[PDB]
Structure formats: structure tokens, C-alpha cells
Amino acid sequence: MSLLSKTRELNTLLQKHKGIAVDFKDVAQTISSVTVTNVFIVSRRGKILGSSLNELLKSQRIIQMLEERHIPSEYTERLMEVKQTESNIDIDNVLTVFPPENRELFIDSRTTIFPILGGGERLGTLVLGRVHDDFNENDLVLGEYAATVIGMEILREKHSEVEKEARDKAAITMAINSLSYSEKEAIEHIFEELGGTEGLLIASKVADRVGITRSVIVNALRKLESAGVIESRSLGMKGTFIKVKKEKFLDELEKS
């Protein structure tokens, strides 16, 4: 398979399509199969977002050892310190991604490390490994492109995650601030009865058993609904369905 053929595969298979969430496991398999390598996609903090081995090796002993090994966190955390592309790293190098014990099976291994950059910040690391062969200039071009694509998908993922967490934290703080002292106490009792974050509430009956008025319960939920912390729905002449939408709300509430 020629350089231009490999490029077509990666353009067609890695392209972001509307309606699809990025699956880093499947990204690693595409890279592994196109470039004939073992692939490890590592977040900036060292989490293995996705991996795939080149299972087309002749030696079942090598395959089984790679299948059995879990990349240590000590290694993945070192990758952040690699600031530029390091290619054709040998087995004696501390940056090798291959197992350290059986030096003779991996004596000819090469590791290549690509920093994944996005918006002027480190987003993660792409690590490629080969048991017997070198990374030539065509291989490095394909590796860099893969790293570029992954960075764009992480960047979109992180952008939306930071915005969501901020939206949730603002909603919780505004909900908690808008609650009176009695309304706060009622919410604590409400979720003490529901035994969780979701369930059916019979306000009148629960108000009776806790020594609180139905009006206080109703107003407290109304403020949480207005803040977007929960959703509420009456289920008939009695009963209200309650679901917390901000997971960290109750934890933050008790801190108030």
C-alpha cells in the first residue's frame, strides 16, 4: 500500500461526520491498521483514551505479551514531558512503549511519540510502536496527520466539557443562593424521602410526615426548576416526578 493510498484511507475514515461521537478506540484501530503499528492515544493527564495492537505479527509470543501488558501510569505521565516529535526510539530508551523485561524479543523495536497540540496547549500524546521495523519519512507524515486529527477532536471535546461544567456550577450556585433557610431544609428532607436523586414525591403526604407545609415544598422545587437544577412534572391530582439534572447539586447544597 502506497503513501497516497494510506492517505486516502485516513482522510475517508478519520473525517468527522455530523451525527457521530468520536470513539478513540476505533480511531486507534484505524491508525494501527493503516500504518501497521501499535497505537496508544494518551490524554495530557496520562489516560489511555484508545489503543490497538498490530495483531498481524507472526510471533504469538510477542502478541500475547503485548496483549497482557498494561501501559504503566508512570510511563504515560512521562509523555507530557516530551515536547516535540521523537521518532525511532529504541528499546533501551526510557521512552520506549514496549515491555522492558524481554529485551531480546523487542531488541529491534522502534517507538515514535507525537505531541498532540491544539490552541497553544498540550492536549495529549500519540504513541506508535513497531516490533521489528523503522519509521520512515512517509510513516512520520502519516503519524503527524493522525496526531493533528486527534487534537482537533479532543479540542472540540474539551471546549464543550468546560462550558457544560461551568454552566452546571453556575446553575447550582444560583439555585442554592435563591433558596431561603426553610426552603433549603425542605429540599434536604425531600431527597431524604426519595432516597436518591430521582423518584415520585407525594408532597402533601411528605409535608405531613416532616412537619413542613406543602407550600414550602412547592416553592423550593419551583426555585430549583427555575434554576434548571431539576425537572418537575405533576402526575395527576397528586404526586410530582422529581429528577436532579445537576449531579453535584446535593453535594454542594450540604456545603451551603
Numbering used by the authors: 1 to 256
Which lines from the publication concern this structure?
In Gram-positive pathogens such as Staphylococcus aureus (Sa) and Enterococcus faecalis (Ef), the pleiotropic transcription factor CodY plays a key role in integrating metabolism and virulence factor expression. CodY DNA-binding is activated by two types of ligands: branched chain amino acids (BCAAs, i.e. isoleucine, leucine, and valine) and, in most cases, guanosine triphosphate, GTP. Each 30 kDa protomer comprises the N-terminal ligand-binding domain called GAF (cGMP-specific phosphodiesterases, adenylyl cyclases and FhlA). The GAF domain is connected by an extended linker helix to the C-terminal DNA-binding (DBD) domain that contains a winged helix-turn-helix (wHTH) motif.
Unexpectedly however, the structures revealed a previously undescribed monomeric form of SaCodY and a dimeric EfCodY. Nevertheless, ligand-free SaCodY can also form dimers, as confirmed with SEC-MALS. This suggests that a monomer–dimer equilibrium may be a factor in regulation of SaCodY activity. The asymmetric unit of the ligand-free SaCodY crystals contains two well-structured monomers with their GAF and DBD domains tightly packed head-to-tail. Therefore, it is possible that the dimer observed in the SEC-MALS experiments of ligand-free SaCodY is the non-biological head-to-tail dimer observed in the crystals. To determine if the DBD domain of ligand-free SaCodY is flexible in solution, we used hydrogen deuterium exchange mass spectrometry, which did show the DBD domain to be flexible. In more detail, in absence of ligands, Arg69 in the H3–H4 linker, extends its side chain into the vacant Ile binding site making a hydrogen bond to the main chain carbonyl group of Val97. In the ligand-free structure, elevated B-factors suggest that the H1-H2 loop region (residues Leu14-Phe24) has increased flexibility. Superimposition of monomeric ligand-free and dimeric-activated SaGAF domains shows that residues Gln15-Lys18 in the ligand-free domain cause steric clashes with the linker helix and S3–S4 loop of protomer B. This may explain the monomeric state of ligand-free SaCodY.
